[PDB]
Copies of this chain bind each other. A is one copy, B any other.
Amino acid sequence: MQQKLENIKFVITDVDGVLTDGQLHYDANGEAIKSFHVRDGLGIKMLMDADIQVAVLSGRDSPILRRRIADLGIKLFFLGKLEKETACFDLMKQAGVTAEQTAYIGDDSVDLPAFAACGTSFAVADAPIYVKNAVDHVLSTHGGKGAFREMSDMILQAQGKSSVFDTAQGFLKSVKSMG
């Protein structure tokens, strides 16, 4: 993984079952709550601060997700988008990066075309076998439990930028970019 992890400048993430644990919390009007993970959020800020852009690609759209996106300072994203191959290529163009500079993390069949578009692919731990087979690296953490952060930790460390998370002094240098 080292040689691909080293050249990542852009990360695209699916939401449901990656940034969340797959649960859709309905009320009478549809999605009412989305549950994201706090250590994921910090990982997102760490990547951005380390000159790695972050994008969101989801087959669902909601004002809730759009709010979490704003909270995190995420700029590039396509929502309600079920055909994800063309979506990935469009996001890379906006990011000013190539496919081999791009990493994608997913959990289900809808992500299979995204895995094909991006140079590096990750699956969350609770992903089905046919998804795990299609990615470069299967993560040890379940979706919505820090799976993104585990990935972001890997990418940063590969590029020698682990101080932001493994030392008090490293964190307290990018602290203005953390929230």
Secondary structure of the A side of the interface? mixed
Q: Is the CB of B39 within 8 A of A35?
A: no
Complex Cα distance, B113 from A175, in Å, reads 11
Q: Please give the count of copies of this chain that the complex contains.
A: 4
A53-90 vs B, CB cutoff 8 Å, 1 = contact: the mask equals 00000011001100110010000000000110100000
Q: Which residue of B lies closest to A28 (CB)?
A: B63
Q: Is the CB of A42 within 8 A of B109?
A: yes
A37-59 vs B, CB cutoff 8 Å, 1 = contact: the mask equals 11101100000000000000001
List residues of A whose CB falls within 8 A of some B CB.
16-17, 20, 22-30, 32-39, 41-42, 59-60, 63-64, 67-68, 71, 82-83, 85, 107-110, 112-113, 115-116, 126, 128, 130, 134, 144-146, 149, 153, 164-168, 171-172, 175, 178-179
